[PDB]
Every structure is written in structure tokens, then in C-alpha cells.
């Protein structure tokens, strides 16, 4: 009703014994420097994967809300924006496997979503279940980028800065509720990204969040592209805060901050 | 569209005849968050039984919601249920109404209504409220006024409703108020003014006066006394507030002419 | 199928002209400049026989709290609710030859099943041409003619049209899909675009419900009658005349953009 069983099914072997890790990569809540999404897109461009289920977009998508994009050229409609929402099985660069679940959070019908996606990490086994956050925060591009960790197994993690809060609800956290209830195995990882920066793609944050999940899911992932897109980056953000005093302001006040709560944490 | 609760609650009853249904959905006339608070204070200061819940997933576009999560202690602790449901509440002196209270419905009203009239034909209820709260040019130093349309608005004594004809953005419950009379059945819907520079945040005067409405229409008690004490207090900021700037002062006087002149002309026409 | 029902009796069809009927898309909601895709299908409406062939279910495909269809309350009574009727008609033209015309809310849920049963409607209907409608805000004065582009696979049966073009990105709509879903299945298709002066846009501009309506009259071979439409284009271009004579800045907004029209008028052509 959700979903779509792909035919035939992709075989998920471990040559290693264990159940899988899920990766949960939604775009639509927490998209700070485009960092979720380019999780979801970096791994599928550089590793083999397979399309294990596609969930029903008329069940699950307000679409003048999202508008796909539509390509005219050669004076046709010649292509439109899918906007897949999928579970992968996807081979590390030993080819141990793993899930993903990545596209748009759904619009509509978060329960049976939220059930469905239950159902399938029973079906396949799944031992942990990872979500992916990106949030701007009021931080530095000059300092490191910062993880923390909810849900119960966040044990697994080792690079983590991790109070009582309230967030707007996502799709991803109702999983992670009903994960939780059910006894399982779920942690949500969510990236800090200068807030200055959230609008723009943030290779530094979808690199914290890859290398986040290669640790803890004992991954061996390919991210040396990413590590040069952040240098990139870097280096041009560093041209234009070097080009003018305002800005060079703020950061030097952020740094500060940072530097200090660091000490408080520590 | 909806789930009745088992083992059902007996919504009798003798009091002799059929309850009336207050409906009090979230989303659409918030002036002063008075709709919320009205629902709100009868569940936390009355006894209530659930009737029947509906599906969130047939009724909400979740992204425009976003009902709010809760992490405490590195763990997602709770998640809001956003329970549109259909309550029976019983007053002060354990007199049973009916009331639907929870989010508007962001699809599927003729479902929606069409479910709702099945559940007021299943309780036999007799008159139908739904309740509004729209930001009006009025001021914070004068009465809180409600205006009632429907077909049975002459259960309401107090209600400066001198009104015509207007076209407003299209609701659940206005839908849902069109079906019950189109099928002949008793329906009236409330609406509190509420000073509209005070319209975004609580405005308690207004919940009070939505409730004292549905007190005096439905012959309910109703322990009122938080609201008054809470009235006074928003006053109190309001005054100083006002007291602080000629501009305000000028603004609410203003306010004050046109109050006064158009309760005037109500009175006027309503011996 | 469960996204619409069919009107019975089935009203009449037919013409005295072989091959089937043209199929005019009007879906408002997505590409709305001058209101002009709104007022093309409530024109035609207004001036011409027409009969309703299928409705389409609101509850499968509108998202209300986002389009609140409008009531009506007069006598403290609610008198009137707005139906926001998404439907498919069969409409007459002067010489009383069908066409049919899709007019209403753009859907915004089930884009999927929706564009599968408007394609399940052409096919039973024997539609051998649809046409999408737009209207967009772009640079251009009020000061010169109303352009139309087109994109698809039957633009050559409209004549005057600045189309054709090149690569371009724009968001998502339901008449998009259900062209590329045409597209797919060997139809013929086309959108038409009209260039509206992004200053006026969030206005009535007659002007440009005009064109579009001449578009299709040339394209459909229909005679379509659209002489009140230039009537109200005259008393709107009056009133915009005035509104550049109070306004100093307003003329040279609209000097600037008469020069970069009538220059790439020529310029590029």
C-alpha cells in the first residue's frame, strides 16, 4: 500500500553475519548546507546499490507543495524529477552491505509511513537504525563540525558533543519513536552548520555525517571527494571573510563562543 | 475517517434529550489562541470520556503540522498525538455534552463532515456550536463581543450580531455547518472579536466569553474562575503597555468611538 | 478512476467535423499571471454551450486548508460554499463544433492517478490534441504586444508564437506531468505560454487571457467569440496608461523594458 517490492529482490549478503544497518536520509525538515540529501546522493553516486522498494508518491506526497522539477528542452517536456523515495541495499567499498532509505520525507501519512518502515527493518533483519539531521547553528565555518546524538545507540558513535528541547516533528522522528517503543535499535545524528552557510551546500557537514555513520556502523565508505569539496569551500569562505571586517566580526565572536563552551563541555 | 472507542462510553442522559455538540478545531480563526483554550480548559478542568478518534492519516498534511516531538536526556521522549477525537464531557453538575476538538482537518472535508453528521445522528444530538475566533477592530478596554450565525442563535441572549452578507476563506466546520442545515438539522457557529494588534497571543477574555456563550446556550455550569484570573492579568500587561505610548493611547481610543457608537446603533435596532 | 466520475447522461459528443476534439487544459494554481488561465476557461464558459462530462473528487486530490474555497455568509446564515469544481465539459463554439476543456483547481495531491485518468479521458473520447495553458510573469511592458511561447509536439499548428527554444528548468505541475505522461504515450501535446509584464501580474490582465484564447481559436480551428476581451483589455490598458503618467518612476521601469523588447524584437528574429 505504501510500497513497492522490487522484483526480483535484491539479495543483501553479509559475507559478514549480523544484521544490516538502516540509514534513514529524508530531505524536507532538516536540510541545513543541502547536507541530508547529499548523504543519501554522495553514496549512491559512488557505491553499488539496489533498489529493494519504492514507496507510492500518490500515498505520500502534496505536490504543489514539492513541484519536481521539469526539464524542457528541444521544445518537450523532456524530463521530470521522480522524487524516489527508496530502501537500497548498498556494498561499502568491501562490499559489506547496508540500508538506505532515502527521497523526500513524505507530506502525508506519517503513521502508515512510519509502520511500513517498521515492517521492512523486521523483514530485513535490520539491527540499527541511523536518521540523518542537518541543523543551522550558531557556529564557525573555522571550527570543527559537531554531531550530537539521540535515541539507544548513540554508544556506537565516538566523535559526538551530546539537554531537554522541543522540536517541530518529522517523519524520521515518529520512526524513531516507534522504533524506540518496539525495543530497537535507533540513534538520530544531526550536523551543526553555520547558520551563515545552511542555505548553500556544506560538504564539511555531509562529511561528518558519512564519517558518523562509517564509525558506527563499521563502514568502510569513500569520502576523499568530499573531504576536497570541503577544502574548496573552506578556502573560498576564507577569501570572503578575509574581504571584509563585518563578517571577520562575527566569526571571531562565534569562535569565541565555540572555544569557551567547548572548555564548559569538557 | 474515524475509530469509535470500545467499550463505548454511555453518554446518558437524564437529563432527558439530545446533547449538543461543541466543535472547537485548531488551524483556521486562532485570534488570541481562544479556540485552544476554550477545549483545552474543559479537558483539564472537567471530566471527559473519549467517543470516537480519527485518522490523522486520511485528515493531515503532517509537514504543514509538524506535531511537535520532545527530547530530554539524549532520547525522542514524546511525540503530540494531535488527537482530533469526539469527547463526552460532563459540566459541574455532571450534565453530558459533546464536544470535537483537535486540528482542523487538512483534507478530505467532505468525508470529514459527512463522518461528523454520521456521529451526530449516532448521539443523537440536538444543536451543533462551532467556534471562531477572529482578530476585529475593537479594543482591549471594552467588552469582549461574539456574533452568532446559523439556525439556532436565538439560543444565545448576548451576541452583538448586527451583521449582512461576506465572503470569508472556506473551513472544515463551515462546510461542515452548511451539511447540517442543507440535511435540516440544528447548527450555530460563535464568533468572539478579539482586538486584533493582541491577536497573536493568548487572549484570554475571548476564550471566556466563547465559554460563557456555550454555558448560556447549551445550560451547562462551568468552572470559569482560572479564566478570570488569567483575563486580569492580561489587562494588566495590556494597560501598561498602552499607559507607556501617546501613539497606543491615540489607537485605542479610537477604537473605543467606533465600540461604543456601533453598540449604539445596536441597541438602536434591538429594543 | 476513483479520481473522477462520469456525468449521466452522457452528454453529446459529437460534430459535423471528422477527427476528434482539441482537449483545453486550465488548471489554476501553478502559472496564474494576470489570472489569465482562470479567466481563459470562465470566458469561454460564460459565452458558449457547454455540458459537463466528469467531475473529479476534491477529497482525493485538494488539499483544503490550503485552498479554503470560499463561503458565502449573509442573513447570519451560511448560504454558500464554493465547490471548486475540477471537471471535463464538452463546450460549443459559434459554428457549434466540440471541444473539451479540463478547468478547475490544479490537483495537489495524486498528480500520478490524476494525469492516468485524464489520459484514460482522452482516449475514450477520441481527443486527438491537448493543449496545456500558462500564464507567466516576464519582463515585458504593457506597452507592446502579448507574446505567446509554445513547447511540445503539435506548436506548429499555432502560427503566431515566438517559440520555438532551449534548455530550461522550472518547478512541477500537474498539466506538466500529464504532458510528458502524453508525450510518453505517442499523443499529440502542447503548453502555451503567455508573457505577462511582471508588474501587472498579480492583476487581471485581458490582454493575455486574449491571447491565449486566440491561440487555441487559430490552433483548434474554433470560433471562439473574444471581442468583450478586447474591450476589457482597452479599459485596463487605460488605466495603466494613467498609473505611468502620475509615476516618473514608473515610466522608466517601462521605457527600459519597451527598449529591451522592441530591441531583441528585431535584434534576435
Same mark, same amino acid.
Given at each position: 500500500?505504501?510500497?513497492? !517490492?522490487?522484483?526480483?529482490?535484491?539479495?543483501?549478503?553479509?559475507?559478514?553475519?549480523?544484521?544490516?544497518?538502516? %540509514?534513514?536520509?529524508?530531505?524536507?525538515?532538516?536540510?541545513?548546507?543541502?547536507?541530508? $540529501?547529499?548523504?543519501?546522493?554522495?553514496?549512491?553516486?559512488?557505491?553499488?546499490?539496489?533498489? %529493494?522498494?519504492?514507496?507510492?508518491?500518490?500515498?505520500? %506526497?502534496?505536490?504543489?507543495?514539492?513541484? @519536481?522539477?521539469?526539464? %524542457?528542452?528541444?521544445?518537450?517536456?523532456?524530463?521530470?524529477?521522480?522524487?524516489?523515495?527508496?530502501?537500497?541495499?548498498?556494498?561499502?567499498?568491501?562490499?559489506? @552491505?547496508?540500508?538506505?532509505? +532515502?527521497? @523526500?520525507? @513524505?507530506?502525508?501519512?506519517?503513521?502508515?509511513?512510519?509502520?511500513?518502515?517498521?515492517?521492512?527493518? $523486521?523483514?530485513?533483519?535490520? $539491527?540499527?537504525?541511523?536518521?540523518?539531521?542537518?541543523?543551522?547553528?550558531?557556529?564557525?565555518?573555522?571550527?570543527?563540525?559537531?554531531?550530537?546524538?539521540?535515541? *539507544?545507540?548513540?554508544?556506537?558513535?565516538?566523535?559526538?558533543?551530546?539537554?531537554?528541547?522541543?522540536?517541530?516533528? #518529522?517523519?524520521?522522528?515518529?520512526?524513531?519513536?516507534?522504533?524506540?517503543?518496539?525495543?530497537?535499535?535507533? #540513534?538520530?545524528?544531526?550536523?551543526?552548520?553555520?547558520?551563515?552557510?545552511?542555505?548553500?551546500?556544506?560538504?564539511?557537514?555531509? /562529511?561528518?555525517?558519512?564519517?558518523?555513520?562509517?564509525? #558506527?556502523?563499521?563502514? *568502510?565508505?569513500? !569520502? /576523499?571527494? !568530499?573531504?576536497?569539496?570541503?577544502?574548496?569551500?573552506?578556502?573560498?569562505?576564507?577569501?570572503?571573510?578575509?574581504? +571584509?571586517?563585518?563578517?571577520?566580526?562575527?566569526?571571531?565572536?562565534?569562535?569565541?563562543?565555540?572555544?569557551?563552551?567547548?572548555?564548559?563541555?569538557?
Amino acid at each position: 500500500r505504501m510500497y513497492e !517490492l522490487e522484483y526480483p529482490s535484491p539479495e543483501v549478503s553479509g559475507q559478514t553475519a549480523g544484521g544490516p544497518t538502516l %540509514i534513514v536520509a529524508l530531505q524536507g525538515y532538516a536540510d541545513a548546507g543541502h547536507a541530508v $540529501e547529499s548523504s543519501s546522493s554522495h553514496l549512491m553516486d559512488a557505491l553499488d546499490h539496489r533498489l %529493494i522498494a519504492s514507496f507510492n508518491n500518490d500515498e505520500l %506526497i502534496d505536490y504543489r507543495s514539492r513541484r @519536481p522539477v521539469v526539464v %524542457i528542452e528541444h521544445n518537450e517536456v523532456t524530463s521530470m524529477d521522480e522524487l524516489n523515495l527508496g530502501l537500497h541495499v548498498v556494498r561499502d567499498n568491501d562490499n559489506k @552491505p547496508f540500508l538506505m532509505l +532515502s527521497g @523526500p520525507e @513524505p507530506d502525508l501519512r506519517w503513521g502508515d509511513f512510519s509502520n511500513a518502515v517498521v515492517d521492512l527493518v $523486521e523483514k530485513f533483519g535490520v $539491527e540499527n537504525t541511523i536518521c540523518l539531521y542537518a541543523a543551522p547553528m550558531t557556529v564557525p565555518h573555522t571550527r570543527p563540525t559537531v554531531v550530537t546524538a539521540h535515541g *539507544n545507540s548513540t554508544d556506537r558513535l565516538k566523535d559526538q558533543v551530546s539537554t531537554r528541547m522541543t522540536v517541530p516533528g #518529522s517523519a524520521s522522528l515518529m520512526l524513531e519513536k516507534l522504533l524506540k517503543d518496539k525495543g530497537k535499535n535507533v #540513534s538520530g545524528y544531526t550536523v551543526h552548520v553555520p547558520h551563515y552557510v545552511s542555505a548553500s551546500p556544506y560538504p564539511a557537514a555531509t /562529511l561528518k555525517l558519512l564519517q558518523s555513520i562509517a564509525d #558506527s556502523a563499521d563502514l *568502510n565508505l569513500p !569520502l /576523499l571527494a !568530499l573531504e576536497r569539496d570541503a577544502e574548496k569551500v573552506h578556502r573560498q569562505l576564507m577569501e570572503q571573510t578575509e574581504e +571584509s571586517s563585518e563578517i571577520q566580526r562575527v566569526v571571531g565572536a562565534l569562535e569565541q563562543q565555540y572555544d569557551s563552551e567547548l572548555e564548559r563541555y569538557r
